[PDB]
Design a protein around this ligand. Structure first.
Ligand SMILES: *[C@@H]1O[C@H](CO)[C@@H](O)[C@H](O)[C@H]1NC(C)=O
Ligand SMILES: [Cl-]
Length: 119
């Protein structure tokens, strides 16, 4: 039931496969890819080496056969990326979006909570 990742910028991660919809609302990987291109300059900037993984974990969350929820990022990784990259966005009059609000992810990977804590 898991589909291969078709987004070229989300390829050499820990995982190979996804299932839509993602944590942003897209039913189609192509819609996620288009929206993700917004961030490639921020990724090239290199405010956080975890940014690419964080974004991919949100736009194409991990899929496994044994689990039937998508697996996105833990809230600690989100915070670590936000704290480094938000100040760069604010220089250009941009803000960290609600769609990546770190409180909406699980604080840590628990028995309560399934999430990827990042590399
Ligand atoms: C982020 O989400 C939390 C939890 O839903 C919400 O309470 C909060 O309003 C959001 N953060 C901010 C700064 O509004
Ligand atoms: Cl904070």
């Amino acid at each position: 039931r898991c589909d291969p990742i078709r987004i070229s910028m989300c390829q050499n991660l820990g995982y190979n496969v996804t299932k839509m919809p993602n944590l942003v609302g897209h039913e189609l990987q192509t819609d996620a890819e288009l929206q993700l291109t917004t961030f490639t300059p921020l990724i090239q900037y290199g405010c956080s080496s975890q940014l690419q993984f964080f974004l991919c974990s949100v736009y194409v969350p991990m899929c496994t056969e044994k689990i039937n929820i998508p697996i996105g990022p833990c809230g600690g990784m989100c915070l670590s990326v936000k704290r480094r990259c938000e100040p760069v966005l604010k220089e250009f009059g941009f803000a960290w979006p609600e769609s990546l609000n770190c409180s909406k992810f699980p604080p840590q990977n628990d028995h309560n909570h399934m999430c990827m804590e990042g590399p």
